[PDB]
Design a protein around this ligand. Sequence first.
Ligand SMILES: CCCCCCCCCCCCCCCCCC(=O)OC[C@H](COP(=O)([O-])OCC(O)COP(=O)([O-])OC[C@@H](COC(=O)CCCCCCCCCCCCCCCCC)OC(=O)CCCCCCCCCCCCCCCCC)OC(=O)CCCCCCCCCCCCCCCCC
Ligand SMILES: CCCCCCCCCCCCCCCCCC(=O)OC[C@H](COP(=O)([O-])OCC[N+](C)(C)C)OC(=O)CCCCCCCCCCCCCCCCC
Ligand SMILES: Nc1ncnc2c1ncn2[C@@H]1O[C@H](COP(=O)(O)OP(=O)(O)OP(=O)(O)O)[C@@H](O)[C@H]1O
Ligand SMILES: [Mg+2]
Lengths: 256, 96, 231, 74, 108
Amino acid sequence: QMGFSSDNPYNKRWEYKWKHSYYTYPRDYEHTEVRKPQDSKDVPPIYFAYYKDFVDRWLPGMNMWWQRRHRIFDKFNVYFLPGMSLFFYQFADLALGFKIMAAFPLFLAYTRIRDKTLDPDFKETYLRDMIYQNPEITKYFNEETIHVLDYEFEYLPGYLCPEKFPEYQNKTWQFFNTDTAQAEGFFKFGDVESGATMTLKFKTMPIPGKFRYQVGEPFYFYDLRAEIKCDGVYKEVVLVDEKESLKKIRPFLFLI
Amino acid sequence: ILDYLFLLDLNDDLTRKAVFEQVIIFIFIYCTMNFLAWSTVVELIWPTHFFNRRHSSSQEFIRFRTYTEVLLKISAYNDFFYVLNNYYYNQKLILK
Amino acid sequence: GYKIRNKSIFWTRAGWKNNWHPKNFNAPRPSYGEFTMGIRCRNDHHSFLRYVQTYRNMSRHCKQYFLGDKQLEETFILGLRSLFLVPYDSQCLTDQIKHGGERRFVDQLDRDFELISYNTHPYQLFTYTVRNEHLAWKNEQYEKIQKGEKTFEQELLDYLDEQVLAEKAKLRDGQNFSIERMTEIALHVFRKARAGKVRPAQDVRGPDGNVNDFLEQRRPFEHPNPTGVTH
Amino acid sequence: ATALYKSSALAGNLFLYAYNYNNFTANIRLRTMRYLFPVVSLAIFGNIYWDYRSQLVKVNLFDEYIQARAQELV
Amino acid sequence: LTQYVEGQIVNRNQLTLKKQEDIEQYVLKLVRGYFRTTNKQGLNINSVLQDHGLDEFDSIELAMQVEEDLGYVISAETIPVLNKVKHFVNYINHVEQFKAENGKAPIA
Ligand SMILES: CCCCCCCCCCCCCCCCCC(=O)OC[C@H](COP(=O)([O-])OCC(O)COP(=O)([O-])OC[C@@H](COC(=O)CCCCCCCCCCCCCCCCC)OC(=O)CCCCCCCCCCCCCCCCC)OC(=O)CCCCCCCCCCCCCCCCC
Ligand SMILES: CCCCCCCCCCCCCCCCCC(=O)OC[C@H](COP(=O)([O-])OCC[N+](C)(C)C)OC(=O)CCCCCCCCCCCCCCCCC
Ligand SMILES: Nc1ncnc2c1ncn2[C@@H]1O[C@H](COP(=O)(O)OP(=O)(O)OP(=O)(O)O)[C@@H](O)[C@H]1O
Ligand SMILES: [Mg+2]
């Protein structure tokens, strides 16, 4: 689900990505039809530019943190960092080093809360390059004739089944994370040339690559499936199967 | 009623700092200076716009119509223009 | 009449007539993954769709104040396209601009739309003024036609059709009534009609046919020179 | 005289806003003036009235003391 | 739901096609209504809008008109792929199928 959403009706999956050059916000939200001069309000009220920045930039930003608040309720953010801040806050009047060591764990918490509440963005260009290389899909779909009907991609809550992913039964990792960092979603596609539709389901997880400490790909499609439907033909394509992928690569278990 | 409104006092400002009375003098000068400089910059784009839109076209290139030139030709034509077109049409396309 | 004589007028340190990538010291340089730790860049691949939605908005938000005038909606579209087609038809190589011409133009159109959303863009106010003056002239014609009266535009067309007959009835040696000849006849009438507006036709003399109008005149007692002294 | 002048200069700003009402109200490039002109106007009024009010209080304290202290000395 | 038409306020009407034959007729009537279209009678189901004097910016105006007549909310990501009459017909069907199965309009 898209966390950053205003009352604007168009381009919901790009609202957080698009960086507009407006000095302020437009008077009205993007019109879905031609309206009348009396449908809109001339010379909008005083302090309108500030009101818009709050309801179009601030408020949808807080709705994102509230929508994904279950990913920041870890013992490290809840108890450790606030407790570390209070220990040095009692000596804040003795020196400046105590003010710093008391505010640092708060800035660290904001950074983890900031990155964990963002909408999960996979490398969509890697994805389209993967499906357009399959011949069974290029038979009915092409980038010049494809259109999106629906999009869903959200993190999975809590720890998963402790037989398919035993990695997350680690008390040290659980101290920093309450979620899995994995995401699941789908893509409703359509081709206006062939008249075909397909649901591109996918599951992602972070994996390590070529290095010791850094993550290689935070959103690696370990399960990628396409249920194609045409005039009278139904096909099921498997670009990436989880039974064969989970035997080669395992998740990353982010810390901090 | 709060004490924050005491900042409005200027009768007894010499009892605390006596600084407001001299700082604003600079602020007024700074505004006057920026008024002269900025007005000169933003106003003096017109000589370049006037010359280029009247002398920059050439025959080895295509001059494309602008928004204003579209509205004027279609919705700001005078009577003589309306008469000339219909005068050419009737004589050549109708009456040969 | 007068041509630029300097042959190096269009020379720049970046080449001839180069207004897309002027030469500067801090020039763009490549980046290598294996050696790059972090980067701060604002460039993205969202300019295409922003170029599409910006058009849809500027068009739909301008039509709110056209009052269903179909001829104005179609005229405005032609003008809106002339504004979006600048990068595709310009001499400037917009694909070679310094840091991406696509992002540059899209961000520029967004500033125009912001003013359009408030109905404060000078193109909008100019369209309203131009259109109102046009309809006032069209309604004047309608009111004169409903009364069976003749419009000043139709009187010219009829006066020009008969002059063509008079000029071609004597053009027997040749039979090519060129568009050049048709033109000078109409312009000669226009110049006399143009001068007639300020000095109407009182008698058979015609429009602006009185010499006495050009004798010494004086301002009326009720409207003297308000701006300066007279003596 | 000072309070009357500073009040007339404040009234001058109100005319400047009224004379240019259509621009301050509809042109978004002048939104910051539209939003903060009244805040500055109140802060200016406050200084004008604060000084007049304080001066008025002191004058009344001065007048009531010389009358009281005079009768004691009589 | 009202709009100005030649200076007069008129109530706008929305259409519900739900049939293949009604879609092909609407798109042609739509494309033939655009003042930029050439060879209006030579236009068929397999007609490339480029061959009739239409560019990318004209497809937007056409899509903008589809939203007016049908009430759809078409995203900017879908417009630039509508370059043939066949494309409008298939897109209109895909939207009707999506709402008939998913019970909601596609993501805008
Ligand atoms: C050498 C001897 C030296 C003598 C010294 C004196 C020098 C002369 C001084 C001249 C300047 C002062 C003008 C005094 C009036 C003179 C008459 C005049 O204007 O000339 C003829 C003038 C026509 O001008 P014109 O030269 O013939 O041709 C002009 C062109 O056509 C073009 O048309 P236009 O309309 O665009 O032209 C505008 C024209 C005329 O504009 C006008 O409309 C005139 C009105 C100006 C009002 C001045 C502000 C007063 C505010 C109201 C105070 C009311 C107090 C009482 C309240 C009681 C109710 C509670 O020019 C001006 O605007 C003059 C403005 C002067 C600068 C003011 C700058 C102030 C900031 C600096 C402050 C400095 C401290 C001193 C401030 C003192 C303030 C008291 O006549 C009219 O305009 C008729 C107006 C009819 C309708 C008026 C309706 C009332 C409008 C009130 C505005 C309310 C504002 C918001 C409320 C504020 C109160 C809270
Ligand atoms: C005990 C008291 C509690 C402490 C008080 C803290 C006050 C916090 C609010 C004032 C600080 C504002 C600083 C903002 C600086 C950055 C600008 C910004 O906001 O970016 C937003 C950004 C908006 O996104 P963006 O700006 O990063 O990018 C947007 C991208 N485009 C343009 C494409 C859309 O979002 C965030 O930063 C995340 C949300 C942060 C929320 C800020 C704190 C909200 C506090 C809510 C609770 C307050 C309770 C009090 C109310 C009680 C009732 C009266
Ligand atoms: N090769 C690059 N060089 C310099 N800066 C980059 C580069 N790639 C990305 N950036 C910056 O990092 C940001 C995020 O990159 P990212 O690939 O995640 O965007 P994206 O829109 O999600 O791509 P995709 O659609 O393929 O998923 C970008 O907006 C950009 O500012
Ligand atoms: Mg992405």
